């Protein structure tokens, strides 16, 4: 398929399979929002722009009636951002591991990796500004919360139990999935007292899915959600690729770029653990 | 193999094989320099020296794109590859009593040999080589200090290393991060933290997610917290060890190992230093 | 054995059979030093002597090399070989009964003395011949003493075996170690460790790695901790247990059991000792 | 959500020695609105439900 897209690359087509697995192998490892949230298909080129429905929040009786009813959906548009990252290669080395029959060397492209997947992380929790694409903890109806101390006592068992008499009471249950900051996650493996058990041992009973950190969140802060399709998705539209740019002088550019956008129905399937302090 | 190599060799190839293995397993058993650190491929017998790029200094969003690229200060700089070796001896009276009593045959010298060798890869790993100009992790340029207090309270560790994170953070250096420190630090840790009832190097390795090791090359009050994953620090090698046949001196048979190495670090702002105060 | 070295015996070729396999399974279970150190081939009868090389405690990079040769000096010295033995009686009318009344016969004698000498081993092992002017481990030039305090209030022990472990990594010795202790102090581990809510004998297992043993051979308030290796400390075996069959006597059957071993130590660093307190 | 806390001094959870007793699972509704509990015994001939379609 490649040497035809680019004929003017230099790179042939097994060093470019490589530079692609090295690229996407970076990429695998720092994504972390993928995990718990679902994703829509491939739409293609055709679209740049999709629209949601936003729902903020019978008939018992014999055989009859002739009518129908209806709830308001709150129609929205959106369009999707794209995101690149660039790196440069040089040709004397090249000529030098041709000559010595030494493979090549495909470094820098770890680091625009990185960077790309730490901006799409960002982007899906705190949103962008300048499409006004709301981010995880923005949403209004986001039916907050508010913690206490967890160094001492094991409050921390207690305030899970609150935050989800919330959304029980508000007939949302099912599988939870639970983002807090590193700081807090690390004292959750003190011992429970009287039990002589790690809390997080009976966290996990409650939470039945996986609990992860992320570096995204800067403050002791934490977010559990009700996980499921028809409440959040994410629909991409093209996948991490990278493309050869045109040669100046001697030397050769390459880009890598990808395309995401995020979208939420319901915004009461969220609760948001706050610091008092904060 | 090593038989048609060496004519005038008195082991024989089941010897030889032996061999290899007693001299690579000590080695293996006290290389801790090697632990996280990835290796530059063979380059092979014809290169003596190479080249590296010192950066020392965000993606773009956007809708229609961009029509400009970015570039970086490559500032190029060259070194050349040393080598390090040591010898052993055999002695001959004591191989005629085994061969003709069918006694196995003793190769216990080769381990000391592999250890001393090792040593000395360490000590120009951390510290670094004045004669060929080439520097060391602890004395680079931008190495991003910091200060500890007293740890010989209970809580003082776990703060520490927590700004020193925090720094790092917004330097922008994020992902896994690996830790050495002194003997004597290494011992503080085991002891119980009060409010937890859990041991502080429990809680430390939550953080560093990625190994706690000691080295006896530091001296007193001292550790390194270093960004792992390559395009960072890399290590090159063109020979690995090797083992030797020397001549005949006397009636007995000398042997000599040897191997080649040097490191290269690409960005200075990865490694942070913790020192002592009042020293 | 076979009943063609041994004519003349009343015991029939099946039944010494039984004996010996009665022999080896009581020998196996009351050796407890052959467990953590390894074993030389058997030489058979050809020799009765042996040579060991005491080390008792630098490499250099150049660019080309260097045409002079240096090697380490070491010092020489030679041992024998002892031999150990124990002797019982059986007797004719028992015997008799036996196969009048077709019962099996008992031979607890024969585990009794194997018993006997395996105690004896160890006890040469750890304490030395000065007969014969051979070594032991408890006393040795350059074994890296250490006092120890208390052990009564639960984290002393854990700290004592904490700071005898840093003495041994200090001097370049970092491996898996093995710690042999007195019945007292093996039983004393057994209480909770302080706050931690866990028994204090796991963390010490959990440090030591390989396993923590008791011998009834130490007395009082001793411990041991060596550094496993081939060429730490080896042990040299001429012939392993054995059954001779002396010669009829004034109408009973007398017989013994022998075996052949002896003990080489190195390099004398590995090992360390916690000597007890003021006594 | 109130069974949750420790019973007492046994050291254990109180939600399992109630779950023990009762043998058939504990469940909650929305439609109960303030404090209200209904326990029943299973049985065909006590209770059923026919289903038209």
Redo the contacts between chains.
Sequence with gaps: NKSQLYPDSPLTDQDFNQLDQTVIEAARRQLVGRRFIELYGPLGRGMQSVFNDIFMEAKMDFQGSFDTEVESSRRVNY?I??????F?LYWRDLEQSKA?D??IDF??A???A???A??EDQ?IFHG?KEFDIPGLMNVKGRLTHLIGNW??SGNAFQDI??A??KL??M?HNGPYALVLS??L???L???HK???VLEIEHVRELITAGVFQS?VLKGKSGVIVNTGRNNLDLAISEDFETAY?GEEGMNH?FRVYETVVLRIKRPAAICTLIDPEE
């Design positions: 369009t951002p794209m995101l690149y990252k660039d440069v010595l030494i493979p470094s820098v770890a680091n625009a990185r960077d790309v730490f901006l982007m962008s160094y001492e139990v609150e989800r008499n029980l009471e007939n590193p700081e996650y690390s004292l493996h003190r011992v009287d039990t002589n570096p740019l550019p």
